[PDB]
Design a binder for this molecule. Structure first.
Ligand code: SF4
Ligand code: SF4
Ligand code: SF4
Lengths: 70, 314, 80, 206, 97, 169, 156, 176, 110
C-alpha cells in the first residue's frame, strides 16, 4: 500500500546523503586526518601560513608539537 | 582531488531530481486513492530512466525564434545557477566555505529570472512573453520578501556565514523564536519556484512551451534542483540538526531526513489546494506578507538589544 | 475607540497584528532594563590590542599585571 | 487584465442530431437523447419518454415510475459529481476529482447491471422501462448510498471553508433575479439567484 | 507490536511463491506478489487464483501462461488470452468457476 | 600569467563595455552589461570587497538590470554595419593599449599608467579578527546618521515622484 | 554478426524507452472523453503504466481522438497533429472517430477521423469501456515494442 | 420545502471574532485540508492490476456481436431482416436466398462495427435469438477494414464465444 | 581557485548538456514543417501596472540594500543611534508602502 513509495524516497535519501559524506571524507583525507581549517578572517590565515612555514613540509596540517623546541 | 568533490556534489543532484520526479508521481498518486508508476520497473524504479531516454530521442521542435542566442542561453543560465547554488551548503561542511553564503544564494536567486525573461523573449509568441512577464514579476516580489525575512533571521544569527547557523541552533531550533518568519519564508520559497498553488503558466500560456524536449527537460532539472535546494536551505535555516565534529554522518542523516520531509510537504501542498489568481498572489504579498515582514523586521532589530541577546560577530 | 479596535480586528487582523508588533518594537527598548547590559557587553569585547601606558610614576588606578585587582572587572558578564 | 467583450463560437459539435431524428422511428430516436448530455444520460431519456407518452395518451405502470425517479436521482449524482469536480479541476484543485470518480465508477456498475451499458443505457423507453431490476440490485444501491454522505463531506472539507476556493468564487458571475429570467436561465442559475423555482416541485412528474 | 505481523505476512508472501526465484518471477511478470487460493488452470496454462479477503475487483486474478499457441507470452501478456469459460468467472459474471 | 588575473579580468570588463557602447539592441546591450557587471564583481572580489561584489550581483544585476530588460521586453519589437564597425574599432584600440603597456611597461594617455601587475600595490599586513570593509559598511548606522536620513528621504521622494508622473492626469 | 546484434539491442532499448513513457494528448470532444477520464480514474489508473494524465500537445507522443469530428473541427485537429513531434501515433476511440457511428449520414460529420490523420489503433465501442481503451493503449505499446527502425537502417 | 444555503450571520462577540482572526492568521482550514489529504494517503488505493484483474460485469453486457446456432449445428438466423430494420445506425446489411435444401437462410450478413452504437436492439428484436451481443470487449484492431464483419466472422465469433453466451442467456432470459 | 573551478565545471556541464539536447536528435532523419497563438496579428498593448510593480520592486530592493548590513551593524557601541537609524529606515519603508497603498498604486496587481 502506502509503503510502495518508500524505494524512491530511499534512493533520494541515499543520493542526498552521498555529497555530505563525500565532502567530509575528502576534507578529512586531504588535511591529515582532521577537519579542514576555516579561515574566515586574516588572522586565521596568518596562523595557517605560519604553520605551513614552520612545518618544513609546506603542509599546514603537519602540526609541529613540543618536540621541535630545544 | 577537488574535482572529485565537485562531481560527487553535482551528479547526485541529477539523480535526486530524477527520482524526485518519480517520488512526486508516486506520492501524488497515493494521495488521490490510486497508485503511481509500478509497471516499468520494480515499484516503478526504472521510470525516470525511461522518461530520460524517451525525452532525449524525441524530435526537437525547432521553433521560429526571433533570436537563437537567448534561446540557447536560457537553459545554460538556468542549469548553471541551479548547480552553482548548491556549493555553500553546510552539510555539515560546505564545498566552498564562504563568509557571505546567504548573500551569495540571494544573489543567484535574484539572477535566476533572466532564464525566464530570455525564454519569454526568444519565443516568437507574444502570449508567452506576457506569461514570462507575469512570472518575472511574481519571482521578484517574492525575492523582496525572501530578502527581508533572511535579513531578520540572520540578525538573530549575527553573521552571514551559513555554517554558523549550525552553531547558533545547538540548544533550540529557530522555528521556536521565529515561527511567523518560518511560515512566511516557506510560502515565499513555494511561490519563488512557481510551485503550487502559485504556478500560473500551467493554467490559463507557458514561456517554455516553444522549447524542444531536451531543453524542456533541462528546465525541469533546473527547477527541481531549485526545489530540493530551497527545502535544504529551509532545513538549515530553521530546523538545524545536532552536529558532532567526530561523526558528520549523524548531521548528514538528520538533515537529509528533514529535507526529505519538507520536499514531501511541497508535494503534499501541491495536491491540496486550488490555484491562486495572479492578482490574488500580488494581494497576498504586497498587502498581507509585506506589512508583517516589516513589523517582524523591526521586532527582530529591537529584540536582541532589549534582551542582552546580541550574538557574536565571529 | 473600543468599537473601532474591534472593527479593525474583525476586518483587517493582519494590519492590527503588524501595528501591534511595530509599537511593541518601538516602545519596548525604552522600558527593558537589559539594554545597558547589551551596551557593556559590546563595550567589553577586545577587538584591538590593549596597548600599555608608560609609567610616569603616579597611576594608582591602572594595573601593573593582567591578574592584578586593578582595572575593570567582568564578574557581571560571568554571572548575568 | 479585464474582459470587456466575450464571443463564444459554437458549432464544433453540431452533429445535426434533430435532422436525423426525422428519418427514424420513435424507438430508433431514443438513443439520440443519450448522446446529447452524456453525463445526464438517463435524465434525457425520461424527458423524451414523457413527451411521447403524452402524445400516445398512455401512462407508465407504477413500478416503472419509481424506477425512473430512482435512476433519475442516481443520474443527478452522476452529473453533479462531474459538474463540481471538473469545475475544481479547471481551477486547480485536482485532488477531489479522483476521489469522487471512484464513486462515479460504482454508479456506472448500477447502469450496466440493469441495462447492459455503462453510460448510454437506452433503458427508459416510452411506456416504462425496457428490463426489470435484477435480483440483489437494490441491496447494492442501499450499500452505496449508506456511505455516500461521507464522500460529500470529504469534498466539502477541501473546498467549502478553503479560503483559496472562496477567493475564486465569492464575487464572480453575479446575476440578478430579473435578468436571469429574461436571459432564459434555468435550474441552479435561477435557484442560486434566490428565485424559488423547481420543476419537480411546481410541475411534478411521475 | 503489530509491525511484526506485517513483516511475517510479507515473509509468507515471499515463501508462498515457491522461493525467492518464483517471488521475483511473479514480481517482474505481474507487478504483484500476493498469494491466493488456486481456483484452477485451463489447457493453455493460465492459473486462476482467488482471495476473498481482498476488496471487490482484486479478489480474483489470473497469472497468464508463458507459451500460448506457439507465441512466447512471458512478457507479452494479453487480455484476450482468457478462454470464455474462465472469462465468465474472471469478470465476476458468476460465482461458480 | 596567473598574477595578472585582475588585469586579465579588466580586459573582459572593457570588452563588455564595447558590447553595449556600440548599442546593437537593448537585449544584447543588457547581456553585455550583465557580463560586465559579473566581471566587475570578480574584480572587486579579488581586492577583498566581498560585500560590495555581492551588492553588485544582488542589486545591480538582479535588481536594476532585471527591470531594464523587463521594460525592454515592452518595447523594441522583435523581428548592422555601424555596430560591428565601432566594435572592431574599440577592440583594436583596446588591444593597442594592451600591447603597448605589455611592451614598454609605462604608457600615458592622460595619466601615467604602469605595466606591472596589480599585485604590487597590495598590503602586507593582516586585518585581525574582522574585515575592515565590513565594519566600514556597518558604520552606516553608528556614524552615517545624516547619510541615512538623506538617502531614506530621497527614496521616499522617488517613490512619490514615480507614482505621480506616470498617472498621466 | 556483431553489428546486427548491436543494432538489435539498441532498437530494443529505444523501443522500451519509447513504449514505457507514453505521453498522451486527448481530444475532449464528446462522450468518449468522459469515458477516457473514467479510465484515468483511480480504479483503472493509466498513470501507473507511465501514461501521464493530460499532457501538453507540444510534448505529447500519442493523440487520442475521443469524440465526433465535425466539419467545423477537422482543420484544428489537422493543425494539432501537424504541430506534434515525431514519433507520433493516433488512437481512434469510439464509433464516431472510427467510422462516424450514429452520425455517419450527417451533413456536418466527418465519416471517420482516418480521412484527416493516419490512425494506428481503432478502439470500437459506444463508448468503449475504460478497460477497452486501456487494452487499446496496451496494444499500441505492443505495436511500438515490435518496431524495427534500427534494423531497417542497418539493412539499407 | 426550501433551505437557505449561505444565509448565516456570524457572531460579532470577542470570542468568535478572535477565533476568526486566529483562523486567518494561523491557517486552520489549510491545515484541515492537509490533514484530509494525509489521511487519504494511508488508505488502500482502489487500483486493480489490469490485465491480470478485470472489472466486474453483468450478464446483460453488450460487447462484440455474434451469430448463434441451434444445439444441432443448424444456424438460428432465418433471414427475417428484423435486426436491420430496427438498427438505428443502419449498421446491418442482409441479403438472402433459399439454399440447396430449401431453407430460408442468409447469404450475406454484414455488421459495420464502426457504425454500430452497441445498443442491443438487434438481439432484442431477434425472434430466434440468432444475433447476440457477446461479453467480449478486448477486440480493438489496427486497421479500419478489420472492423467490417461479414457472416463468416460473426459465425466464427459465435462458435468461439458460445460457451459463455449460452450461460449469459440462461442467466438473463427470465427478465426478458 | 576552488570557486572558479566549480563555476567552470558547472558551466561546462551545462553547455555539454545543452549541446547534447540540441544536437543528438538532429542527426536523425525526419520531415520538415511549415513556417507557421491568439495574438499573432495584434500588437502588444502597454500595461502600466506591470511597469509600476517593476519600479516598486526596484525601489523596495534599493531600500533592502540600504537595510542589509544590520547583522554587522548590531555589534556597535552607539546602540541607541543604531537602533534609531534601523527603526527609521524600516519606518520609511513602511511609509512608502502605505503611501503606495493609499494612492491606488497597487491596483489590479494588488
Ligand atoms: S462513439 Fe458513442 S460514446 Fe463515443 S462520442 Fe460517439 S456517440 Fe458518444
Ligand atoms: S447494437 Fe444497435 S446499433 Fe449495433 S447492430 Fe445492434 S441494433 Fe444496430
Ligand atoms: S432478427 Fe434474427 S432471425 Fe431476423 S434477420 Fe436478424 S439475426 Fe436473422
Amino acid at each position: 500500500m502506502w509503503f510502495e513509495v518508500l524505494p524512491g524516497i530511499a534512493v533520494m535519501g541515499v543520493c542526498l546523503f552521498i555529497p555530505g559524506m563525500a565532502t567530509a571524507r575528502i576534507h578529512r583525507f586531504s588535511n591529515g586526518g582532521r577537519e579542514k581549517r576555516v579561515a574566515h578572517y586574516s588572522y586565521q590565515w596568518y596562523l595557517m601560513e605560519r604553520d605551513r612555514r614552520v612545518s618544513g613540509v609546506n603542509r599546514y596540517y603537519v602540526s609541529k608539537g613540543l618536540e621541535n623546541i630545544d | 582531488m577537488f574535482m572529485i568533490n565537485v562531481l560527487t556534489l553535482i551528479i547526485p543532484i541529477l539523480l535526486a531530481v530524477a527520482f524526485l520526479t518519480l517520488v512526486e508521481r508516486k506520492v501524488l498518486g497515493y494521495m488521490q486513492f490510486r497508485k503511481g508508476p509500478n509497471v516499468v520497473g520494480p515499484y516503478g524504479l526504472l521510470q525516470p530512466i525511461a522518461d530520460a531516454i524517451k525525452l532525449f530521442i524525441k524530435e526537437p521542435l525547432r521553433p521560429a525564434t526571433s533570436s537563437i542566442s537567448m534561446f540557447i542561453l536560457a537553459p545554460i543560465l538556468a542549469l548553471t545557477l541551479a548547480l552553482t547554488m548548491w556549493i555553500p551548503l553546510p552539510m555539515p561542511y560546505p564545498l566552498i566555505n564562504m563568509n557571505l553564503g546567504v548573500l551569495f544564494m540571494l544573489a543567484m536567486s535574484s539572477l535566476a529570472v533572466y532564464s525566464i525573461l530570455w525564454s519569454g523573449w526568444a519565443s516568437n509568441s507574444k502570449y508567452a512573453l506576457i506569461g514570462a512577464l507575469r512570472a518575472v514579476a511574481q519571482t521578484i516580489s517574492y525575492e523582496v520578501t525572501l530578502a527581508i525575512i533572511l535579513l531578520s533571521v540572520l540578525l538573530m544569527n549575527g553573521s552571514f556565514t551559513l555554517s554558523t547557523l549550525i552553531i547558533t541552533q545547538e540548544q533550540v531550533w529557530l522555528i521556536f523564536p521565529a515561527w511567523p518568519l518560518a511560515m512566511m519564508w516557506f510560502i515565499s520559497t513555494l511561490a519563488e519556484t512557481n510551485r503550487a498553488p502559485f504556478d500560473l503558466t500551467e493554467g490559463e500560456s507557458g514561456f517554455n512551451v516553444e522549447y524542444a524536449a531536451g531543453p524542456f527537460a533541462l528546465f525541469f532539472m533546473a527547477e527541481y534542483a531549485n526545489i530540493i535546494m530551497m527545502n535544504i536551505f529551509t532545513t538549515t535555516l530553521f530546523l538545524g540538526a545536532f552536529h558532532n565534529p567526530y561523526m558528520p554522518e549523524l548531521y548528514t542523516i538528520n538533515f537529509t531526513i528533514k529535507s526529505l520531509l519538507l520536499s514531501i510537504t511541497f508535494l503534499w501542498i501541491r495536491a491540496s489546494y486550488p490555484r491562486f489568481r495572479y492578482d490574488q498572489l500580488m494581494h497576498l504579498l504586497w498587502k498581507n506578507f509585506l506589512p508583517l515582514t516589516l513589523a517582524l523586521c523591526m521586532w527582530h532589530v529591537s529584540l536582541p538589544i532589549l534582551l542582552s541577546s546580541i550574538p557574536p560577530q565571529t | 475607540v473600543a468599537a473601532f479596535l474591534k472593527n479593525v480586528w474583525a476586518k483587517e487582523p493582519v494590519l492590527v497584528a503588524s501595528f501591534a508588533i511595530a509599537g511593541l518594537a518601538v516602545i519596548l527598548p525604552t522600558l527593558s532594563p537589559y539594554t545597558k547590559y547589551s551596551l557593556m557587553i559590546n563595550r567589553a569585547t577586545p577587538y584591538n590590542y590593549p596597548v600599555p601606558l608608560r609609567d610616569d610614576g603616579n597611576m594608582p588606578d591602572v594595573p601593573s599585571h593582567p591578574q592584578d585587582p586593578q582595572g575593570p572587572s567582568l564578574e557581571w558578564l560571568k554571572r548575568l | 487584465e479585464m474582459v470587456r467583450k466575450c464571443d463564444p463560437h459554437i458549432g464544433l459539435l453540431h452533429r445535426g442530431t434533430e435532422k436525423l431524428i426525422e428519418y427514424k422511428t420513435y424507438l430508433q430516436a431514443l438513443p439520440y437523447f443519450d448522446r446529447l448530455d452524456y453525463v445526464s444520460m438517463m435524465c434525457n431519456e425520461q424527458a423524451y419518454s414523457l413527451a411521447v407518452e403524452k402524445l400516445l395518451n398512455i401512462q407508465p405502470p407504477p413500478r416503472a415510475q419509481w424506477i425512473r425517479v430512482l435512476f433519475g436521482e442516481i443520474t443527478r449524482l452522476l452529473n453533479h459529481i462531474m459538474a463540481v469536480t471538473t469545475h475544481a479541476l479547471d481551477i486547480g484543485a485536482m485532488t477531489p476529482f479522483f476521489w469522487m470518480f471512484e464513486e462515479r465508477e460504482k454508479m456506472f456498475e448500477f447502469y450496466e447491471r440493469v441495462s447492459g451499458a455503462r453510460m448510454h443505457a437506452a433503458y427508459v423507453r416510452p411506456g416504462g422501462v425496457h428490463q426489470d431490476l435484477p435480483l440483489g440490485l437494490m441491496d447494492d444501491i442501499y450499500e452505496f448510498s449508506k456511505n455516500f454522505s461521507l464522500r460529500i463531506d470529504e469534498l466539502e472539507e477541501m473546498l467549502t471553508n478553503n479560503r483559496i476556493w472562496r477567493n475564486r468564487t465569492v464575487d464572480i458571475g453575479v446575476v440578478t433575479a430579473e435578468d436571469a429570467l429574461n436571459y432564459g436561465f434555468s435550474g441552479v442559475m435561477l435557484r442560486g439567484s434566490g428565485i424559488q423555482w423547481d420543476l419537480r416541485k411546481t410541475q411534478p412528474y411521475d | 507490536m503489530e509491525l511484526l505481523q506485517v513483516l511475517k505476512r510479507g515473509l509468507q508472501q515471499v515463501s508462498g511463491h515457491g522461493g525467492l526465484r518464483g517471488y521475483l518471477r511473479v514480481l517482474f511478470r505481474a507487478n504483484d506478489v500476493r498469494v491466493g487460493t488456486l481456483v484452477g488452470e485451463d489447457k493453455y496454462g493460465n492459473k486462476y487464483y482467488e482471495d476473498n479477503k481482498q476488496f471487490f475487483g482484486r479478489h480474483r486474478w489470473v497469472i497468464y501462461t508463458t507459451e500460448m499457441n506457439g507465441k512466447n507470452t512471458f512478457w507479452d501478456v494479453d487480455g484476450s488470452m482468457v478462454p470464455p469459460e474462465w472469462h465468465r468467472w474472471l469478470h465476476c459474471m458468476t460465482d461458480d468457476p | 600569467m596567473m598574477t595578472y588575473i585582475v588585469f586579465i579580468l579588466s580586459i573582459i570588463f572593457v570588452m563588455g563595455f564595447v558590447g553595449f557602447s556600440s548599442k546593437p539592441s537593448p537585449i544584447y546591450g543588457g547581456l553585455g552589461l550583465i557580463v560586465s557587471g559579473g566581471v566587475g564583481c570578480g574584480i572587486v572580489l579579488n581586492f577583498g570587497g566581498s560585500f560590495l561584489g555581492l551588492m553588485v550581483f544582488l542589486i545591480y544585476l538582479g535588481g536594476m538590470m532585471v527591470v531594464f530588460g523587463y521594460t525592454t521586453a515592452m518595447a523594441t519589437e522583435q523581428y548592422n554595419k555601424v555596430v560591428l564597425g565601432t566594435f572592431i574599432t574599440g577592440l583594436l584600440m583596446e588591444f593597442l593599449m594592451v600591447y603597448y603597456v605589455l611592451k614598454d611597461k609605462e604608457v600615458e594617455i592622460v595619466f601615467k599608467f604602469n605595466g606591472m601587475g596589480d599585485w604590487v600595490i597590495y598590503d602586507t599586513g593582516d586585518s585581525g579578527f574582522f574585515s575592515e570593509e565590513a565594519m566600514g559598511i556597518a558604520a552606516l548606522y553608528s556614524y552615517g546618521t545624516w547619510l541615512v536620513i538623506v538617502t531614506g528621504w530621497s527614496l521616499l521622494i522617488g517613490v512619490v515622484v514615480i507614482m505621480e508622473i506616470t498617472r498621466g492626469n | 554478426s556483431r553489428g546486427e546484434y548491436v543494432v538489435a539491442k539498441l532498437d530494443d532499448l529505444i523501443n522500451w524507452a519509447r513504449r514505457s513513457s507514453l505521453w498522451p494528448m486527448t481530444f475532449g470532444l464528446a462522450c468518449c472523453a468522459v469515458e477516457m477520464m473514467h479510465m484515468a480514474a483511480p480504479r483503472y489508473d493509466m498513470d501507473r503504466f507511465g501514461v501521464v494524465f493530460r499532457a501538453s500537445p507540444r510534448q505529447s507522443d500519442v493523440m487520442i481522438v475521443a469524440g465526433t469530428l465535425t466539419n467545423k473541427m477537422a482543420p484544428a485537429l489537422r493543425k494539432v497533429y501537424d504541430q506534434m513531434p515525431e514519433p507520433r501515433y493516433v488512437v481512434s476511440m469510439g464509433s464516431c472517430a472510427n467510422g462516424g457511428g450514429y452520425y455517419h449520414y450527417s451533413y456536418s460529420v466527418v465519416r471517420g477521423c482516418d480521412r484527416i490523420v493516419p490512425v494506428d489503433i481503432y478502439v470500437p465501442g459506444c463508448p468503449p469501456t475504460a478497460e477497452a481503451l486501456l487494452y487499446g493503449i496496451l496494444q499500441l505499446q505492443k505495436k511500438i515494442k515490435r518496431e524495427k527502425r534500427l534494423r531497417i537502417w542497418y539493412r539499407r | 420545502t426550501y433551505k437557505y444555503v449561505n444565509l448565516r450571520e456570524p457572531s460579532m462577540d470577542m470570542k468568535s471574532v478572535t477565533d476568526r482572526a486566529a483562523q486567518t492568521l494561523l491557517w486552520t482550514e489549510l491545515i484541515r485540508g492537509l490533514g484530509m489529504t494525509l489521511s487519504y494517503l494511508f488508505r488502500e488505493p482502489a487500483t486493480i492490476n489490469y490485465p491480470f484483474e478485470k472489472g466486474p460485469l453483468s450478464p446483460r453486457f453488450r460487447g462484440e456481436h455474434a451469430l448463434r446456432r441451434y444445439p444441432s449445428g443448424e444456424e438460428r438466423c432465418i433471414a427475417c431482416k428484423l435486426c436491420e430494420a430496427v438498427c438505428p445506425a443502419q449498421a446491418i446489411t442482409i441479403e438472402a436466398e433459399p439454399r440447396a435444401d430449401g431453407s430460408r437462410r442468409t447469404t450475406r450478413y454484414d455488421i459495420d462495427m464502426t457504425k454500430c452504437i452497441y445498443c442491443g436492439f438487434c438481439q432484442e428484436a431477434c425472434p430466434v435469438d440468432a444475433i447476440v451481443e457477446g461479453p467480449n470487449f478486448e477486440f480493438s484492431t489496427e486497421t479500419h477494414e478489420e472492423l467490417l464483419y461479414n457472416k463468416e466472422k460473426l459465425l466464427n465469433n459465435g462458435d468461439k464465444w458460445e460457451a459463455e453466451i449460452a450461460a449469459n442467456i440462461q442467466a438473463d432470459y427470465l427478465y426478458r | 581557485m576552488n570557486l572558479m573551478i566549480t563555476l567552470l565545471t558547472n558551466f561546462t556541464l551545462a553547455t555539454l548538456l545543452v549541446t547534447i539536447a540540441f544536437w543528438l536528435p538532429q542527426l536523425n532523419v525526419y520531415s520538415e514543417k511549415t513556417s507557421p497563438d491568439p495574438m499573432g496579428s495584434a500588437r502588444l498593448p502597454f500595461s502600466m501596472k506591470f511597469f509600476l510593480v517593476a519600479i516598486t520592486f526596484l525601489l523596495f530592493d534599493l531600500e533592502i540594500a540600504l537595510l542589509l548590513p544590520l547583522p554587522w551593524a548590531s555589534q556597535t557601541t552607539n546602540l541607541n543611534t543604531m537602533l534609531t537609524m534601523a527603526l527609521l529606515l524600516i519606518f520609511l519603508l513602511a511609509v512608502s508602502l502605505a503611501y503606495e497603498w493609499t494612492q491606488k498604486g497597487l491596483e489590479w496587481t494588488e
